[PDB]
Coordinates of C-alpha atoms and ligand atoms in Angstrom, one line a residue:
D1 CA 150.3 -32.0 108.1
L2 CA 147.9 -29.4 106.5
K3 CA 150.4 -26.5 106.5
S4 CA 152.9 -28.8 104.7
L5 CA 150.2 -29.8 102.2
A6 CA 149.5 -26.1 101.4
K7 CA 153.2 -25.5 100.9
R8 CA 153.4 -28.5 98.6
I9 CA 150.6 -27.2 96.5
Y10 CA 152.1 -23.7 96.3
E11 CA 155.5 -25.1 95.2
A12 CA 153.8 -27.2 92.5
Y13 CA 152.1 -24.1 91.2
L14 CA 155.3 -22.1 91.1
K15 CA 157.0 -25.0 89.3
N16 CA 154.3 -25.8 86.7
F17 CA 152.8 -22.4 85.6
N18 CA 155.0 -20.2 83.4
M19 CA 153.2 -17.2 84.9
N20 CA 152.6 -16.4 88.5
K21 CA 151.3 -13.3 90.2
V22 CA 154.7 -12.0 91.5
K23 CA 156.2 -12.5 88.0
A24 CA 153.3 -10.7 86.4
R25 CA 153.4 -7.8 88.8
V26 CA 157.1 -7.3 88.2
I27 CA 156.4 -7.0 84.4
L28 CA 153.4 -4.8 85.0
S29 CA 155.4 -2.4 87.2
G30 CA 157.8 -1.4 84.5
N31 CA 165.4 -6.6 79.4
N32 CA 162.7 -7.7 77.0
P33 CA 159.9 -5.3 78.3
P34 CA 156.4 -6.0 77.0
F35 CA 155.4 -4.6 73.7
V36 CA 152.2 -2.6 74.1
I37 CA 149.3 -3.6 71.7
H38 CA 146.8 -0.8 71.7
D39 CA 145.7 -0.5 68.1
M40 CA 146.0 -2.4 64.8
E41 CA 149.4 -0.9 64.0
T42 CA 150.9 -2.2 67.2
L43 CA 149.0 -5.5 67.0
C44 CA 150.6 -6.1 63.6
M45 CA 154.1 -5.1 64.8
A46 CA 153.8 -7.3 67.8
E47 CA 152.7 -10.3 65.7
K48 CA 155.7 -9.9 63.4
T49 CA 158.0 -10.2 66.3
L50 CA 156.2 -12.6 68.7
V51 CA 154.2 -14.9 66.5
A52 CA 155.9 -14.4 63.1
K53 CA 154.7 -17.6 61.5
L54 CA 151.0 -16.6 62.0
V55 CA 151.5 -13.5 59.8
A56 CA 154.0 -14.9 57.3
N57 CA 151.2 -15.8 54.7
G58 CA 150.8 -12.5 52.8
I59 CA 147.3 -12.0 51.4
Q60 CA 146.4 -15.4 53.0
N61 CA 146.9 -14.1 56.5
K62 CA 143.7 -14.4 58.5
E63 CA 141.7 -11.3 59.7
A64 CA 143.2 -9.6 62.8
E65 CA 140.3 -10.8 65.0
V66 CA 140.8 -14.4 63.9
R67 CA 144.5 -14.2 64.5
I68 CA 143.9 -12.8 68.0
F69 CA 141.4 -15.6 68.8
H70 CA 143.9 -18.2 67.5
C71 CA 146.5 -16.7 70.0
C72 CA 143.9 -16.9 72.8
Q73 CA 143.4 -20.6 72.0
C74 CA 147.1 -21.4 71.9
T75 CA 147.5 -19.8 75.3
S76 CA 144.7 -21.9 76.7
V77 CA 146.2 -25.1 75.2
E78 CA 149.5 -24.3 77.0
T79 CA 147.7 -23.6 80.3
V80 CA 145.8 -26.9 80.0
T81 CA 149.2 -28.7 79.8
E82 CA 150.4 -26.8 82.9
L83 CA 147.2 -27.6 84.8
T84 CA 147.5 -31.3 83.9
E85 CA 151.0 -31.5 85.5
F86 CA 149.9 -29.4 88.5
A87 CA 147.0 -31.7 89.3
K88 CA 149.5 -34.5 90.1
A89 CA 150.4 -32.5 93.3
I90 CA 146.8 -32.7 94.6
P91 CA 146.4 -35.6 97.2
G92 CA 144.3 -38.3 95.7
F93 CA 144.2 -37.0 92.1
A94 CA 146.9 -39.4 90.7
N95 CA 145.2 -42.3 92.5
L96 CA 141.9 -41.8 90.6
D97 CA 141.0 -43.8 87.6
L98 CA 142.5 -42.2 84.5
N99 CA 139.0 -41.5 83.1
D100 CA 138.0 -39.6 86.2
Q101 CA 141.3 -37.5 86.0
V102 CA 140.4 -36.7 82.4
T103 CA 136.8 -35.7 83.3
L104 CA 137.9 -33.4 86.2
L105 CA 140.5 -31.7 84.0
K106 CA 137.9 -31.3 81.1
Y107 CA 135.4 -29.5 83.3
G108 CA 137.9 -27.7 85.5
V109 CA 140.5 -26.2 83.1
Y110 CA 138.6 -23.2 81.9
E111 CA 137.4 -22.2 85.4
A112 CA 141.1 -22.4 86.5
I113 CA 142.2 -20.5 83.4
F114 CA 139.9 -17.6 84.1
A115 CA 140.8 -17.5 87.8
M116 CA 144.6 -17.4 87.0
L117 CA 144.1 -15.0 84.1
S118 CA 143.2 -12.4 86.7
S119 CA 146.8 -12.4 87.8
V120 CA 147.9 -10.9 84.4
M121 CA 145.1 -8.4 84.2
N122 CA 144.8 -4.9 85.4
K123 CA 142.0 -2.4 84.6
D124 CA 143.8 -1.3 81.5
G125 CA 144.9 -4.5 79.8
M126 CA 146.6 -7.8 80.2
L127 CA 149.9 -9.6 79.7
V128 CA 150.2 -12.0 76.7
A129 CA 152.8 -14.1 74.9
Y130 CA 154.7 -15.3 77.9
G131 CA 154.9 -11.8 79.4
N132 CA 156.2 -10.2 76.3
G133 CA 153.1 -8.2 75.2
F134 CA 150.6 -6.1 77.0
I135 CA 147.2 -5.8 75.1
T136 CA 144.8 -3.1 76.1
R137 CA 141.3 -3.7 77.3
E138 CA 140.0 -1.0 75.1
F139 CA 141.7 -2.5 72.0
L140 CA 140.0 -5.9 72.7
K141 CA 136.7 -4.1 73.1
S142 CA 137.2 -2.4 69.7
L143 CA 137.4 -5.7 67.7
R144 CA 134.5 -6.6 65.5
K145 CA 131.7 -8.6 66.9
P146 CA 131.7 -11.4 68.2
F147 CA 135.4 -11.2 69.0
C148 CA 135.1 -8.0 71.2
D149 CA 132.8 -10.0 73.5
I150 CA 135.5 -12.6 74.4
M151 CA 137.6 -10.8 77.0
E152 CA 135.5 -8.2 78.6
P153 CA 133.6 -10.5 81.0
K154 CA 137.0 -12.0 82.0
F155 CA 138.2 -8.5 82.9
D156 CA 135.1 -7.9 84.9
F157 CA 135.6 -11.1 86.9
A158 CA 139.3 -10.3 87.3
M159 CA 138.9 -6.8 88.7
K160 CA 136.7 -8.1 91.6
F161 CA 138.9 -11.2 92.1
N162 CA 142.0 -9.1 92.2
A163 CA 140.4 -6.8 94.8
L164 CA 140.5 -9.8 97.2
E165 CA 144.3 -9.4 97.2
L166 CA 145.1 -13.1 97.1
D167 CA 148.7 -14.2 96.6
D168 CA 150.2 -17.2 94.9
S169 CA 149.9 -19.4 98.0
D170 CA 146.1 -18.8 98.1
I171 CA 145.6 -19.0 94.3
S172 CA 147.4 -22.4 94.1
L173 CA 145.0 -23.9 96.6
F174 CA 141.9 -22.2 94.9
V175 CA 142.9 -23.8 91.6
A176 CA 143.4 -27.2 93.2
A177 CA 139.9 -26.9 94.7
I178 CA 138.4 -26.0 91.3
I179 CA 139.9 -29.2 89.8
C180 CA 138.5 -31.3 92.7
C181 CA 134.7 -31.0 92.1
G182 CA 132.6 -34.1 92.7
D183 CA 129.6 -32.8 90.8
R184 CA 131.2 -32.9 87.3
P185 CA 129.2 -34.9 84.7
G186 CA 130.2 -38.5 84.0
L187 CA 132.5 -39.2 87.0
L188 CA 132.9 -42.9 87.9
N189 CA 134.1 -42.6 91.5
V190 CA 132.1 -39.7 92.9
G191 CA 132.7 -40.7 96.5
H192 CA 136.5 -40.7 96.3
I193 CA 136.5 -37.4 94.5
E194 CA 134.2 -35.9 97.1
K195 CA 136.7 -36.9 99.8
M196 CA 139.6 -35.5 97.7
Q197 CA 137.5 -32.2 97.4
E198 CA 136.8 -32.1 101.1
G199 CA 140.5 -32.5 101.9
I200 CA 141.7 -29.8 99.6
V201 CA 139.0 -27.4 100.6
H202 CA 139.9 -28.0 104.3
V203 CA 143.5 -27.1 103.4
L204 CA 142.3 -23.9 101.6
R205 CA 140.0 -22.9 104.5
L206 CA 142.8 -23.2 107.1
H207 CA 145.3 -21.5 104.8
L208 CA 143.0 -18.5 104.2
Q209 CA 142.3 -18.2 108.0
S210 CA 146.1 -18.0 108.6
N211 CA 147.1 -15.8 105.6
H212 CA 144.2 -13.4 105.6
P213 CA 143.3 -12.8 109.3
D214 CA 141.8 -9.4 108.2
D215 CA 139.0 -10.9 106.0
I216 CA 136.8 -13.3 108.0
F217 CA 134.6 -13.9 104.9
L218 CA 137.3 -14.8 102.5
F219 CA 136.6 -18.5 102.3
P220 CA 132.9 -18.1 101.5
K221 CA 133.8 -15.3 99.0
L222 CA 136.0 -17.8 97.2
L223 CA 133.3 -20.5 97.2
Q224 CA 131.1 -17.9 95.5
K225 CA 133.9 -17.1 93.0
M226 CA 134.0 -20.8 92.0
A227 CA 130.3 -20.7 91.2
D228 CA 130.8 -17.4 89.3
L229 CA 133.6 -19.1 87.3
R230 CA 131.3 -21.9 86.4
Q231 CA 128.8 -19.4 84.9
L232 CA 131.6 -17.5 83.2
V233 CA 132.7 -20.7 81.5
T234 CA 129.2 -21.7 80.4
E235 CA 128.8 -18.3 78.8
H236 CA 132.2 -18.5 77.2
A237 CA 131.4 -21.9 75.7
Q238 CA 128.2 -20.4 74.3
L239 CA 130.2 -17.6 72.6
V240 CA 132.7 -20.1 71.2
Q241 CA 129.9 -22.1 69.7
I242 CA 128.6 -18.9 68.0
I243 CA 132.1 -18.4 66.6
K244 CA 132.2 -22.1 65.5
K245 CA 128.8 -21.7 63.6
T246 CA 129.3 -18.3 62.1
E247 CA 133.1 -17.7 61.7
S248 CA 134.5 -20.3 59.2
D249 CA 138.0 -18.9 59.3
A250 CA 138.3 -19.2 63.1
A251 CA 139.7 -22.7 63.3
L252 CA 139.0 -24.3 66.7
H253 CA 142.1 -26.0 68.1
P254 CA 141.8 -29.8 68.0
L255 CA 142.7 -30.1 71.7
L256 CA 140.1 -27.6 72.8
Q257 CA 137.2 -29.0 70.8
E258 CA 137.4 -32.1 73.0
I259 CA 137.2 -30.0 76.2
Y260 CA 134.2 -28.2 74.9
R261 CA 132.5 -31.4 73.6
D262 CA 129.4 -32.1 75.7
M263 CA 130.2 -29.4 78.2
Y264 CA 127.3 -26.9 78.3
Ligands
PLM1 C1 150.6 -10.8 69.2 C2 149.9 -11.3 70.5 C3 148.3 -11.2 70.4 C4 147.7 -11.6 71.7 C5 146.2 -11.8 71.6 C6 145.5 -12.0 73.0 C7 146.0 -13.2 73.8 C8 145.1 -13.5 75.0 C9 145.6 -14.7 75.9 C10 144.5 -15.0 76.9 C11 143.3 -15.7 76.4 C12 142.2 -15.9 77.4 C13 140.9 -16.3 76.7 C14 141.0 -17.8 76.2 C15 139.8 -18.1 75.3 C16 139.7 -19.6 74.9 O1 140.7 -20.4 75.0 O2 138.7 -20.0 74.3

């Protein structure tokens, strides 16, 4: 039954996420090729084509860094929606109390976002805007503080994560495992969540044994990556709070304020 479960999870991931690692790699290899954003000129050209409304305000347009952060947030909002539908495929998740489902998604979504973001990153940049842009790592590093500090730690995570050479069948189960954590704050039915976690981690362990016979440590490596992601998210939330206190024009999306509320 466990092999079928792993396949169910994988198929739900292919159905629910607009981006997957095969799709990303086709684009990254070289109709509607990605526009390269490597400097301010190319950022502004890409915006006029791909997010026209955001730059249709004349002198009232926000600063480039703020527009970029707004696009970051919109991407995360969309991935939250995808993750919420994906979670229905996880055995036991839809049987939990609605409040526990909310709590698991609240604490898990950014860990999952940063894990999956690795699939659209290479050492030089990342896919954005539904695969229609490629923004360079160096351009993001060139932004004014604090905005240049957003992406670089995610690239650092992603380069090591990508060196594990996971595929979509592994990543789908890793994301399911992130969502099923019994130690999130405020859970009502910890015991049932712990059982759900044990089941999905068992599926993950057996799948990695079968799909990666060459890497006998891969399961504990991925357990460590989950802990690393929790630290990456805590640090990300600290930076977002700096932006919220010091950058008045950088409006925080109403759906993401709730995810951050009483996190770190
Ligand atoms: C014209 C397109 C500009 C694109 C600007 C960069 C888009 C990055 C998308 C990935 C965001 C990852 C970080 C999310 C941060 C957050 O939600 O707090």
